[PDB]
Design a protein around this ligand. Structure first.
Ligand SMILES: CCCCCCCCCCCCCCCCCC(=O)OC[C@H](CO[C@@H]1O[C@H](CO[C@H]2O[C@H](CO)[C@H](O)[C@H](O)[C@H]2O)[C@H](O)[C@H](O)[C@H]1O)OC(=O)CCCCCCCCCCCCCCCCC
Ligand code: CLA
Ligand code: CLA
Ligand code: CLA
Ligand code: CLA
Ligand code: CLA
Ligand SMILES: CCCCCCCCCCCCCCCCCC(=O)OC[C@H](CO[C@@H]1O[C@H](CO)[C@H](O)[C@H](O)[C@H]1O)OC(=O)CCCCCCCCCCCCCCCCC
Ligand SMILES: CCCCCCCCCCCCCCCCCC(=O)OC[C@H](CO[C@@H]1O[C@H](CO)[C@H](O)[C@H](O)[C@H]1O)OC(=O)CCCCCCCCCCCCCCCCC
Ligand SMILES: CC1=C(/C=C/C(C)=C/C=C/C(C)=C/C=C/C=C(C)/C=C/C=C(C)/C=C/C2=C(C)CCCC2(C)C)C(C)(C)CCC1
Ligand SMILES: CC1=C(\C=C/C(C)=C/C=C/C(C)=C/C=C/C=C(C)/C=C/C=C(C)/C=C/C2=C(C)CCCC2(C)C)C(C)(C)CCC1
Ligand SMILES: CCCCCCCCCCCCO[C@@H]1O[C@H](CO)[C@@H](O[C@H]2O[C@H](CO)[C@@H](O)[C@H](O)[C@H]2O)[C@H](O)[C@H]1O
Ligand code: OEC
Ligand SMILES: [Cl-]
Ligand SMILES: [Fe+2]
Lengths: 28, 340, 82, 447, 335, 34, 35, 62, 37
C-alpha cells in the first residue's frame, strides 16, 4: 500500500553514513 | 532637488539594480510572468477554444497554456474594465483577458528591459551593443504576437502562450502559409543555426588553443580576471582553421562583431517574413511549377509533394482549430491517400 | 564584490531563518492546497469542474460568439447546468 | 591525501589514475552496482510478471534473457516455472553485497596503493608486461565464460530455439558448427540488406558453435599475453598511459553498443519474438500476411491482384525476381521467421501454399505480431503518434535498441575525448600551449 | 632520398601545407571529391527517381523542371531498401539513375569523409601542439548527418526514408517525420532547439558584450576594427568592464568573469543540445516517439476534453493521411 | 548555524518529492486518460 | 561493369593501406615536444 | 518453520541495513576499526549464515 | 509474482531497482559536505 516507508529510510541512509562522519569528524 | 534625490536612490548599486527603467520593467515583467503562471495552473480555455488549458483541469507542463481570446473579440484590447469583461474578473479570465494582459504587459517589459541595458550601459560607461542586439528579439515578439494577429481576423490567430500551443502555431504556418518555403524564414534559420555554430565553434576553438598558465589540468583556475596577455593563442587558432577549413579569423574585434551580426540579422529577416504573413502575402507557391503540374500528370517534385501535405493539414485541422467557423467536413470530402 | 544585502549563505544558515520559515513556508503551502481542495479556485477563475464541461445530453461547445454581449452570453452558458 | 591540488572536484575520479589500490575499490564497488541492478531488477520484473501474458507486454528485458537460455519456459515460449527467474535474481542481489563490501573496503580502509602491499597486484601503466599480463588474465576469464554458455546449451539443458522443428521450444544443441569456413564466414558477410554480417546468425548450432571458437581463441590469446610483451610496431604505434588504455576500451564498447542495437532490432534467433516483441520487419510482414489471408477468404485471387500503382496489392517481385509481399512491405523482403517460412518456396512465397496451406496458428500469429509492432511513445502509448490512449505498450526491442544507441554513441564521444587527451598528455601539452615555446611560431608562414 | 615512403609520410603529415592533408585526409580528400562531383552532376542533370519503389519517378534536378529551392537528389528506391546499390550492381547507368543510385554513392562518401574531417580536426591540433577536443564539438553536427542519413534509414528499414539532398526535400523529411513520430513533443528535440536557440542567443550575448567593451585605440572616423593587430600580447577588450555591465543587467553572481569558464559554456551549451537532438532522430529511428497525450483529459462523464495536444494530432493526421498517396495498401503504417 | 551541505540535500530530496508527486499525478489525476 | 568494380576496389585498397601503414609509421613521434 | 523463515529473512534485512550503514563509518573514522574489526567480523560472518539459513529454509516454505 | 512466502516483501522489492541511482547522487552529498575540494 505505502512502501514509501521503505524509500524514506534507505533514502536518508545515504546522507546519514556521511553525517555520522561529520560528527565523528574524519576521513571525508 | 527631489528629482536628483529620486535619481540618486534608483541608480544606487544594489544586488538587483533598479534604475529609472525599473519603474517600467519590474512592474510589467513580473505581471507578465505572473499572469502566465496564473493561467497555466488556474484559468481555462473552454469558453475560448473549447480546450482544457490549465493544471487544475489536468493539463501537464507541455499541454498547458494561456490561450488567445475568442475570434468574436476581434482585436479588442480586452481590458478588465472594458465593454467585454465589464470590470468583472472571472468573466475576463473566461474571455481570454489574460492573453492580452500577458501580451501587452510583456511587450512593455521588453521595452523597459532594453531601456535598462541602455541605462546601465551609460552608467558603467560601456558601448550599447547589447541593446542593438536585443532589437532582434523585440522585432520577433512584436511581429509575431502583435503585428501578425493584427493583420488577421483577431487575436485568436496569434500564438497562444504555452509549449504545445506553440507547436500548432508552427504546424499551422506550414499547412496554411507554407512558411518553410519562405526566403525570409530560411534566412532566419540560417542565422539561428549559423549563430549556434559560431557559438560552439568559437568556444571550442578557445578552450583548445589556451596557453598554460597553471600547473593543474583543470585549466579554469589558471585564468587572470585582471586582463594582460591573451588567455588563448589567437595566432595558433588562425593557423589551425587556415589549414582545416581554408579560411580563418584574425581580428578578434571582427570575429566578435560577426557573432552579433549573424543571429541578430537572422531574426530580423524571419520577422519581415511574418510581417508579410500577416496580410497573408505568403511565399506559398511557384507558378511555373503549378502550370506544368496541371497540364502534365507525371511531373512530380518534392515541392508538389509538400503542398499535398499542406492540404491534409488544413482539411483535418481546421474543424477543431477554428471553432468559430462551425466547420463540418463529411468523411467523403476529406482528402486521403490509399489505405491510410 | 559586495553590496549592503546580508550574504544569502549566512541567512540560509541562520537558525533564526528556519525558526521563521519552518512556519512560513509550510503555511503558504497548506494555503494554496486549500485554495484548490475547497473548490474556491474553480470560482475565482470560472474554470469548469470535471462535471461542468457540457450539459448531460448536449455535446456542443459553449463558444462565445460576440464581443459586447459576451459576458451575458457566457452567463447563459452556465444556465443549461453547464 | 588527494584534493584540489590534484584535479578539480568534477574530475575527481582522475585523481585515482595513480592509486592502484583505491582504483581497485572503484572497479570492485562498481561491478557491484551492475550485479545489484541485474539482481534487484530481475526480482522487480518477476514481482510484476504475469504468467498467462506475453513478456513483451510487461516491460521485461531480463526475464526474457534468461528464458532464451532455456529456463522456466517450454513449448512456444510458454512459461512453466518461475523459480529459475527468482533464483538468478536473488543470487545476483546477494553477490552485489559481497562485491560491494570489497569495493568500499579497498577505497577507504585498505592500501591506497598496491605496488608495496604486494608487487603481484600493484601495477605500472607503462609496464607493458604487467598490462599485457593482466589483460591476459581477463582474456581467459572471458574465455571460460564463453564456454559457460556452450555448456548450458550442450549439457545442462539447452536454449530456446524458436526455429524448433515441432515449433519453438527448448532444445539441446548437440552438433555445434565448428567448421571455421562457416563460422568465420559471418565476419566476411556484408552489413547491408540481405547479407547481414553477425546479425544474420539464424540457428543455434552456429551460435553455440561460434562460441566454442571464441572461448578457445580467447583463452589462447589470454595465455599468449601472459607469456609475452608487445612487439616493436605494437609499441611505436600505441600510446602507453592510464588514459590511452581507457580510451581504447571506450571505442571498443561503443562499437559493441552499436552492434548490440542492430542485433536486438533485427535478429530473430538469439532474441526470440516470443519473449521480446516481433522485429520491425516481422510486424510489417505480418500485416501483409493478415490481409492477404483475410481478403483471400473473401474470394480474392491474391496472385493476380493489382494495386493502385499496378504493382501487386498482396504479392510482387523483389529486384532479384523472388516473390514477396506487396505494399510498403517490399523493403522487408529479407525477413525470415518460423511462422512465415512454411509458406516460402524455392522462389519465395509459393502461390499454392499461400492458397491452401495457411494454418490457423499462423493467421493468429500474424494477427498477434501485426497488433504488436515496435511502435510507441515515450509515455508508453503503443501505436502510431496519432493513435489514442488505451494500449499501454512499447516493444522491448524498441527500449533496448534506443537505450543502447545513446550509450554506444556517447561512448564514441568518450573515446574521442579520452583519446585526444591521451595524445596531448603523452607528448605533453594537454594543459596549454607553452607561452614561451609556441610551436606554431616556429613554423614558416603559409599565408 | 632519405627514403621515399619516409618522405611521403613527412609531406602528408607536414604542417607546412596550405591545407593540412592529414592521414585522415588521405581518405577524406578522395571521398569528399567523389561525393561533391557526383552531387553537383546529379542535382543538375540526373533523371527522375522512383523513391517509393512504386514506379512513380520523382524528378528533382534542375534540367528536369526544378529550381534551387525545389530541386534535390532523390533517395534510393524503397525496392532496394537497405541493400547495397553500387554502380556495378546495375545492368546499366539508366537503371542506376532510375533506382536512385547516386544517393547512396553520395551519402556513403560524404559520411565517410565528414568523419575523417573530424579525425583531421584532431590530427592538426596534435601536430600544432594545441589541445584536442575541437573535433569533439564537430562531433555533434556530424552525429546529426549520421542520424539523418544513416541511422534513421537503418532503423526504418530503407534508405528511401533518409533525408533527401535538397531544400524542399528536407522540408518533406520534417513534415512527414512529425506526422509519424510527433517530434515536437519529444524531450530530445526540445533540448535541440534549446541548444540552437540558446546558441544563437549566447552567440549574440558574447559577441555584443565583447565588441561593446573594446578599449579605444581608433579614430572617430576610422573602423573600430583596426584597433587590433594580428599577434597581440594583451587583450583587446575590458573583460572586467564587460562583466561589470552584464553583472548589473541581471545580478553579479549570474555573470561570468572568467573568460575560460565563459568560453566553455559557450561551446558546451550548443554541442550538448545538438547531441541530444541527434540522439532524438536516432532514437525515434526505432519508433520510440514523442509524448502522446491524445484524449488524456476527459470529463466526469467520459467525454473527451481536447487540449492543444489534440489540435496537434489533427494537424499530424493530415500529414499522415496524405503523405505517400499511392504507397500504402494496408491499414497500419509500419514502415 | 546549519551546515550548508545539509540545507541542500534536504531541500534537494524535498524537490524530488514534490516533482515526483507530479509524475505520479500523471497516472491518476485528470491528466490521466482513464 | 565488372571491371569498374575491380578498379574501384583496387583504388579503395590503395588509400586504405596508405592510411593504416601511415599511423603505424610511428605517428605519436610527429608532434612539437615529447616523443 | 514459516515464521522461523520470516524471522531469519526479515532479520537478515535489518542486519544488512545496519551492516550497510555500519562498515562505512567503520573504516571511515580511524577511531578504531580494531575494536569494530570485531563487530564488523561478527556482522559479516553472521550474515553469511543467515543467507544460508534463508537459503535451505526457502525450500520448506515455498 | 514473488514466491508466496516473500510476498510480504513485494513492497520492498518495488523500490530496490532505483537504489543504484542513489549512489551517483550520494557522491554529491559527500562532496558538498567536504566543501567541494
Ligand atoms: C559521429 C558519430 C558516428 C556514429 C556512427 C554510428 C554508426 C552505427 C552503425 C551500426 C553498425 C552496424 C553493425 C551492424 O550491426 O550491422 C547489422 C545491420 C543489420 O543488418 C540487417 O541484416 C539482416 C537481419 O536479418 C535478421 O532479421 C530478420 C529480418 O528483419 C530475419 O528474421 C533474419 O532471419 C535475421 O537473421 C537483414 O538483411 C536486415 O535487412 C539488415 O540488413 O546492418 C545495418 O543495417 C547497417 C548498414 C551498414 C552501415 C554500417 C557501416 C559501418 C561502418
Ligand atoms: C577485482 C578483484 C579483486 C582483486 C584483484 C583483489 C586484490 C587484492 N585484494 Mg581483495 N577483495 C575483493 C576483490 C579483489 N581483491 C573482494 C570482492 C573482496 C570482498 C570479499 C576483497 C577483500 C579483500 C580483503 C579483506 C583483503 C583483500 C586484499 C587484497 C590484496 C592482497 C591479495 C589477497 O587478498 O590475496 C588473497 C589470496 C588469493 C590469491 C586466493 C583467492 C582465491 C579465491 C578464494 C578464489 C576466487 C574465485 C574467483 C572468483 C574465480 C576465478 C577462477 C577462474 C579463473 C577459473 C590484493 C591487492 C588484502 C589486502 O588489503 O592486502 C594488502 C585484504 O586484506 N581483498
Ligand atoms: C507602471 C507600469 C505599468 C504599465 C505601463 C501598465 C500598463 C498597462 N496595464 Mg497595468 N498594471 C501595473 C503596472 C503597469 N501597467 C501594476 C503594478 C498592476 C497591478 C496593480 C497592473 C494591473 C493591471 C491590470 C489589472 C490591467 C492592466 C492593464 C494595463 C494596460 C491597459 C491599461 C490602461 O488603459 O492604462 C490607462 C493609462 C493611464 C491610466 C495613464 C494616465 C496618465 C495620465 C498622465 C494621468 C492623467 C489623469 C487625469 C485624471 C486625466 C485627466 C483627463 C480629464 C479629461 C478626465 C496597459 C498596457 C489592463 C490590461 O492588461 O488590459 C488588457 C488591465 O486589465 N494593468
Ligand atoms: C562509480 C561510482 C564511484 C566510485 C566507486 C568512486 C570511488 C572513489 N572516489 Mg569518486 N566520484 C564519483 C563516483 C565514484 N567514485 C562521482 C560521480 C564523483 C563526482 C561527484 C566523484 C568524485 C570524487 C572525488 C572529488 C574524489 C573521489 C574519490 C574517490 C576514491 C576515494 C573514495 C573516498 O574519497 O572516500 C570517502 C569516504 C566517505 C566520505 C564515505 C563514503 C560512503 C561509502 C563510500 C559508501 C558506502 C556504500 C554502501 C552504503 C555501504 C555498503 C556496506 C555493505 C557492503 C555492508 C574512490 C576510489 C577521491 C579520490 O580521488 O581518492 C583519493 C576524491 O577526491 N571521487
Ligand atoms: C539502460 C538500460 C535500461 C533499459 C533498456 C530499460 C528498460 C525498461 N525499464 Mg528500466 N531501468 C534501468 C535501465 C534500463 N531500463 C536502470 C539502470 C534502472 C534503475 C534506476 C531502471 C529502473 C526501472 C524501473 C524502476 C522500471 C523500469 C522499467 C522499464 C521498462 C519500461 C520503460 C520505461 O517506462 O521508460 C520510461 C523512462 C524514461 C522516459 C526516462 C528516460 C531517461 C533518460 C535516459 C534521461 C536522459 C537525460 C540526460 C541523461 C541528461 C544529461 C544531460 C546533462 C548532463 C547536461 C523498460 C523495458 C519499468 C517497468 O519495468 O515497467 C513495465 C519500471 O517500473 N526500469
Ligand atoms: C580483446 C582482447 C585483446 C586485446 C586487448 C589484445 C591486445 C593486443 N594484442 Mg592481442 N590477441 C587477442 C586478444 C586481445 N589482444 C586474442 C584472443 C588473440 C588470439 C587470436 C590475440 C593474438 C595476438 C597476437 C598474435 C598479437 C597480439 C598483439 C596484441 C597487441 C597489439 C595489437 C595491435 O597492434 O592491433 C592493431 C592491429 C592492426 C594494425 C591491424 C588492423 C586490421 C584489423 C584487424 C582489421 C580491421 C578491423 C575492423 C574495423 C573490424 C571489422 C571486423 C572484421 C572481421 C571485418 C595488443 C596489446 C600483438 C603483440 O604485440 O603481441 C604481444 C600480436 O602479435 N594479439
Ligand atoms: C576543406 C576546405 C573546404 C572549403 C571551405 C570553403 C569556405 C568558404 C570561404 C568563403 C569566403 C570567406 C570570406 O570571404 O571571408 C574571409 C574572412 C577571413 O578574413 C577576415 O579578415 C578580417 C576582417 O576585416 C579579419 O582579420 C577577420 O578576423 C578575418 O581574418 O572570414 C571571416 O572573417 C568571416 C567568417 C565566416 C566565413 C564564411 C563561412 C563560409 C560559408 C559558405 C556558405 C556558402 C555556401 C554556398 C553554397 C552554394
Ligand atoms: C523562486 C524561483 C522560481 C521562479 C519560477 C519561474 C518559473 C519556472 C517555470 C515554471 C514551470 C512550471 C512547471 C509546473 O508547474 O508543472 C506542474 C505539472 C503538474 O502536473 C499535472 O498534474 C495534474 C493536474 O491536475 C495532472 O496529473 C496532469 O497530468 C499533470 O501531471 O507538473 C508536470 O506534470 C510536469 C513536470 C515538471 C516539468 C517542468 C520542467 C520545466 C522546464 C522548463 C524550464 C523553463 C525554461
Ligand atoms: C535498505 C535495504 C537494502 C539495501 C540498502 C542499500 C544498499 C541502500 C543504499 C542507499 C543509498 C546509497 C542511498 C542514497 C541516498 C542519497 C540521497 C537521498 C542523496 C540526495 C542528494 C541530494 C538531494 C543532492 C543535493 C545537492 C544539490 C541538489 C545541489 C548541489 C549540492 C548537493 C549535492 C548537496 C537491502 C537490499 C539490504 C534489503 C532491503 C533493505
Ligand atoms: C566508493 C565510493 C562510492 C561508491 C560506492 C559503491 C559503488 C558502493 C556499492 C555498494 C553495493 C554494491 C552494495 C550492495 C548491497 C547489497 C545488499 C546489502 C544485498 C542485500 C540482499 C538481500 C537483503 C537479499 C535477499 C532478499 C531476497 C532473497 C528476497 C526477499 C527480499 C530480500 C531483498 C530480503 C561513492 C560513489 C558512494 C562515493 C565515493 C566513494
Ligand atoms: C498603469 C495602469 C495600471 C492600471 C491597473 C488597474 C488595475 C485595477 O483595475 C480595476 O479593477 C477593479 C476590480 O478590482 C475594477 O472594478 C470592477 O469590479 C468591481 C467589483 O470587483 C466593480 O465594483 C466595479 O464597478 C468594476 O468596474 C475596475 O473597473 C478596474 O479599473
Ligand atoms: Mn517514405 Ca516513413 Mn511514410 Mn510510411 Mn514510408
Ligand atoms: Cl510525401
Ligand atoms: Fe570570445
Amino acid at each position: 500500500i505505502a512502501q514509501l516507508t521503505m524509500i524514506a529510510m534507505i533514502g536518508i541512509a545515504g546522507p546519514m553514513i556521511i553525517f555520522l562522519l561529520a560528527v565523528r569528524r574524519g576521513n571525508l | 532637488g527631489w528629482f536628483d534625490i529620486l535619481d540618486d536612490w534608483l541608480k544606487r548599486d544594489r544586488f538587483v539594480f533598479v534604475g529609472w527603467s525599473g519603474i517600467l520593467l519590474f512592474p510589467c515583467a513580473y505581471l507578465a510572468l505572473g499572469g502566465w503562471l496564473t493561467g497555466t495552473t488556474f484559468v481555462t480555455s473552454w469558453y475560448t477554444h473549447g480546450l482544457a488549458s490549465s493544471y487544475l483541469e489536468g493539463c501537464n507542463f507541455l499541454t498547458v497554456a494561456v490561450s488567445t481570446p475568442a475570434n468574436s473579440m476581434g482585436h479588442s484590447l480586452l481590458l478588465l474594465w472594458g465593454p467585454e469583461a465589464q470590470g468583472d474578473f472571472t468573466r475576463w479570465c473566461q474571455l481570454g483577458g489574460l492573453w492580452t494582459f500577458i501580451a501587452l504587459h510583456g511587450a512593455f517589459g521588453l521595452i523597459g528591459f532594453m531601456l535598462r541595458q541602455f541605462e546601465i550601459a551609460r552608467l558603467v560607461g560601456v558601448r550599447p551593443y547589447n541593446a542593438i542586439a536585443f532589437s532582434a528579439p523585440i522585432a520577433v515578439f512584436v511581429s509575431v504576437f502583435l503585428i501578425y494577429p493584427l493583420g488577421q481576423s483577431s487575436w485568436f490567430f496569434a500564438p497562444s502562450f504555452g509549449v504545445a500551443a506553440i507547436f500548432r502555431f508552427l504546424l499551422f504556418f506550414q499547412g496554411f502559409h507554407n512558411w518553410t518555403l519562405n526566403p525570409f524564414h530560411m534566412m532566419g534559420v540560417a542565422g539561428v543555426l549559423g549563430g549556434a555554430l559560431l557559438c560552439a565553434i568559437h568556444g571550442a576553438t578557445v578552450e583548445n588553443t589556451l596557453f598554460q598558465d597553471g600547473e593543474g589540468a583543470s585549466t579554469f583556475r589558471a585564468f587572470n580576471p585582471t586582463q594582460a596577455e591573451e588567455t588563448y593563442s589567437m595566432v595558433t587558432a588562425n593557423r589551425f582553421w587556415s589549414q582545416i577549413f581554408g579560411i580563418a579569423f584574425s581580428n578578434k574585434r571582427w570575429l566578435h562583431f560577426f557573432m552579433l551580426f549573424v543571429p541578430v540579422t537572422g531574426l530580423w529577416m524571419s520577422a519581415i517574413g511574418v510581417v508579410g504573413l500577416a496580410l497573408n502575402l505568403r511565399s506559398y507557391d511557384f507558378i511555373s511549377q503549378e502550370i506544368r503540374a496541371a497540364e502534365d500528370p507525371e511531373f512530380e517534385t518534392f515541392y508538389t509533394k509538400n503542398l499535398l501535405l499542406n492540404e491534409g493539414i488544413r482539411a483535418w485541422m481546421a474543424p477543431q482549430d477554428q471553432p468559430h467557423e462551425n466547420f463540418v467536413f463529411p468523411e467523403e470530402v476529406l482528402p486521403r491517400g490509399n489505405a491510410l | 564584490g559586495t553590496t549592503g544585502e546580508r550574504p544569502f549563505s549566512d541567512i540560509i544558515t541562520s537558525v533564526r531563518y528556519w525558526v521563521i520559515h519552518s512556519i512560513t513556508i509550510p503555511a503558504l503551502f497548506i494555503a494554496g492546497w486549500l485554495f484548490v481542495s475547497t473548490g474556491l479556485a474553480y470560482d475565482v477563475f470560472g474554470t469548469p469542474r470535471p462535471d461542468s464541461y457540457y450539459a448531460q445530453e448536449q455535446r456542443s461547445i459553449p463558444l462565445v460568439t460576440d464581443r459586447f454581449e459576451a459576458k451575458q452570453q457566457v452567463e447563459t452558458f452556465l444556465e443549461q447546468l453547464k | 591525501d588527494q584534493e584540489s591540488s590534484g584535479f578539480a572536484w568534477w574530475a575527481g575520479n582522475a585523481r585515482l589514475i595513480n592509486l592502484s589500490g583505491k582504483l581497485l575499490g572503484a572497479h570492485v564497488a562498481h561491478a557491484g552496482l551492475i550485479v545489484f541492478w541485474a539482481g534487484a531488477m530481475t526480482l522487480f520484473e518477476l514481482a510484476h510478471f504475469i504468467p498467462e501474458k506475453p513478456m513483451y507486454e510487461q516491460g521485461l528485458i531480463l526475464i526474457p534473457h534468461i528464458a532464451t537460455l532455456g529456463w522456466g519456459v517450454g513449448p512456444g515460449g510458454e512459461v512453466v516455472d518461475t523459480f529459475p527467474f527468482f533464483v538468478v535474481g536473488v543470487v545476483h542481489l546477494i553477490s552485489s553485497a559481497v562485491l560491494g563490501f570489497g569495493g568500499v573496503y579497498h577505497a577507504i580502509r585498505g592500501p591506497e596503493t598496491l605496488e608495496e602491499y604486494s608487487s603481484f597486484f600493484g601495477y605500472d601503466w607503462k609496464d607493458k608486461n604487467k598490462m599485457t599480463t593482466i589483460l591476459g588474465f581477463h582474456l581467459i576469464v572471458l574465455g571460460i565464460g564463453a564456454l559457460l554458455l556452450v555448456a548450458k546449451a550442450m549439457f545442462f539443458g539447452g536454449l530456446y530455439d524458436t526455429w524448433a522443428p515441432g515449433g519453438g521450444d527448448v532444445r539441446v544443441i548437440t552438433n555445434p558448427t565448428l567448421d571455421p569456413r562457416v563460422i568465420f564466414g559471418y565476419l566476411l558477410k556484408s552489413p547491408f540488406g540481405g547479407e547481414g554480417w553477425i546479425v544474420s546468425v539464424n540457428n543455434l548450432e552456429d551460435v553455440v558453435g561460434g562460441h566454442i571458437w571464441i572461448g578457445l581463441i580467447c583463452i589462447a590469446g589470454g595465455i599468449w599475453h601472459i607469456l609475452t610483451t608487445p612487439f616493436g610496431w605494437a609499441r611505436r604505434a600505441f600510446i602507453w598511459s592510464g588514459e590511452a588504455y581507457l580510451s581504447y576500451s571506450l571505442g571498443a564498447l561503443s562499437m559493441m553498443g552499436f552492434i548490440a542495437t542492430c542485433f536486438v532490432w533485427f535478429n530473430n534467433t538469439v532474441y526470440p519474438s516470443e519473449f521480446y516483441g516481433p522485429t520491425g520487419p516481422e510486424a510489417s510482414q505480418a500485416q501483409a500476411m493478415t490481409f492477404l489471408i483475410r481478403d483471400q477468404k473473401l474470394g480474392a485471387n491474391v496472385g493476380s491482384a493489382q494495386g493502385p500503382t499496378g504493382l501487386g496489392k498482396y504479392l510482387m517481385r523483389s529486384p532479384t525476381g523472388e516473390i514477396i509481399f506487396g505494399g510498403e512491405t517490399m523493403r522487408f523482403w529479407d525477413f525470415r521467421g518460423p511462422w512465415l517460412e512454411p509458406l516460402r518456396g524455392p522462389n519465395g512465397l509459393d502461390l499454392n501454399k499461400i492458397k491452401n496451406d495457411i494454418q490457423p496458428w499462423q493467421e493468429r500469429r500474424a494477427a498477434e505480431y501485426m497488433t504488436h509492432a515496435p511502435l510507441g511513445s515515450l509515455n508508453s502509448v503503443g501505436g502510431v503518434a496519432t493513435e489514442i490512449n488505451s494500449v499501454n505498450f512499447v516493444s522491448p526491442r524498441s527500449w533496448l535498441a534506443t537505450s543502447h544507441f545513446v550509450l554506444a554513441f556517447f561512448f564514441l564521444v568518450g573515446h574521442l575525448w579520452h583519446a585526444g587527451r591521451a595524445r596531448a598528455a603523452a607528448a605533453g601539452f594537454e594543459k596549454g600551449i607553452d607561452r614561451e615555446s609556441e610551436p606554431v611560431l616556429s613554423m614558416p608562414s603559409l599565408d | 632520398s632519405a627514403n621515399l615512403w619516409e618522405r611521403f609520410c613527412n609531406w602528408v603529415t607536414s604542417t607546412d601545407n596550405r591545407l593540412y592533408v592529414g592521414w585522415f585526409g588521405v581518405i577524406m580528400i578522395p571521398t569528399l571529391l567523389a561525393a561533391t562531383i557526383c552531387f553537383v552532376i546529379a542535382f543538375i542533370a540526373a533523371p527522375p527517381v522512383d523513391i517509393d519503389g512504386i514506379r512513380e519517378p520523382v524528378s528533382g534536378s534542375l534540367l528536369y523542371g526544378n529550381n534551387i529551392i525545389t530541386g534535390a537528389v532523390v533517395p534510393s528506391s524503397n525496392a532496394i531498401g537497405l541493400h547495397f546499390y553500387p554502380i556495378w550492381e546495375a545492368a546499366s547507368l539508366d537503371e542506376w539513375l532510375y533506382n536512385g543510385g547516386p544517393y547512396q554513392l553520395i551519402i556513403f562518401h560524404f559520411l565517410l569523409g565528414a568523419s575523417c574531417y573530424m579525425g583531421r580536426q584532431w590530427e592538426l591540433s596534435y601536430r600544432l601542439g594545441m589541445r584536442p577536443w575541437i573535433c569533439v564539438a564537430y562531433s555533434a553536427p556530424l552525429a546529426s548527418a549520421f542520424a539523418v542519413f544513416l541511422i534513421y534509414p537503418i532503423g526504418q528499414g530503407s534508405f528511401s526514408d533518409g533525408m533527401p539532398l535538397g531544400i524542399s526535400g528536407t522540408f518533406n523529411f520534417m513534415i512527414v517525420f512529425q506526422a509519424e513520430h510527433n517530434i515536437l513533443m519529444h524531450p530530445f528535440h526540445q533540448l535541440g532547439v534549446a541548444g540552437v536557440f540558446g546558441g544563437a542567443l549566447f552567440c549574440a550575448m558574447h559577441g555584443s558584450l565583447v565588441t561593446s567593451s573594446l578599449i579605444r585605440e581608433t579614430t572617430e572616423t576610422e573602423s573600430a576594427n583596426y584597433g587590433y593587430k594580428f599577434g597581440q600580447e594583451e587583450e583587446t577588450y575590458n573583460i572586467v568592464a564587460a562583466h561589470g555591465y552584464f553583472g548589473r543587467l541581471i545580478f553579479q553572481y549570474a555573470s561570468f568573469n572568467n573568460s575560460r569558464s565563459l568560453h566553455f559554456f559557450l561551446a558546451a551549451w550548443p554541442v550538448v543540445g545538438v547531441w541530444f537532438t541527434a540522439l532524438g532522430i536516432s532514437t525515434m529511428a526505432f519508433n520510440l516517439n514523442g509524448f502522446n497525450f491524445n484524449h488524456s483529459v476527459i470529463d466526469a462523464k467520459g467525454n473527451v476534453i481536447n487540449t492543444w495536444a489534440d489540435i496537434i494530432n489533427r494537424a499530424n493526421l493530415g500529414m499522415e493521411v496524405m503523405h505517400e498517396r499511392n504507397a500504402h495498401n494496408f491499414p497500419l503504417d509500419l514502415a | 548555524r546549519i551546515p550548508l551541505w545539509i540545507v541542500a540535500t534536504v531541500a534537494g530530496m524535498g524537490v524530488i518529492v514534490i516533482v515526483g508527486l507530479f509524475f505520479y499525478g500523471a497516472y491518476a489525476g485528470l491528466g490521466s486518460s482513464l | 561493369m565488372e571491371t569498374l568494380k575491380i578498379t574501384v576496389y583496387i583504388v579503395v585498397t590503395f588509400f586504405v593501406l596508405l592510411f593504416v601503414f601511415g599511423f603505424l609509421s610511428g605517428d605519436p613521434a610527429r608532434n612539437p615536444k615529447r616523443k | 518453520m514459516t515464521i522461523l523463515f520470516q524471522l531469519a529473512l526479515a532479520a537478515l534485512v535489518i542486519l544488512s541495513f545496519v551492516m550497510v550503514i555500519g562498515v562505512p563509518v567503520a573504516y571511515a573514522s580511524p577511531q578504531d576499526w580494531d575494536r569494530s574489526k570485531q563487530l564488523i567480523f561478527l556482522g559479516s560472518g553472521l550474515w553469511i549464515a543467515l543467507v544460508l539459513v534463508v537459503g535451505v529454509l526457502n525450500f520448506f516454505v515455498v | 509474482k514473488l514466491p508466496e512466502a516473500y510476498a510480504i516483501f513485494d513492497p520492498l522489492v518495488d523500490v530496490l531497482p532505483v537504489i543504484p541511482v542513489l549512489f551517483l547522487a550520494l557522491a554529491f552529498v559527500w562532496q558538498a559536505a567536504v566543501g567541494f575540494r
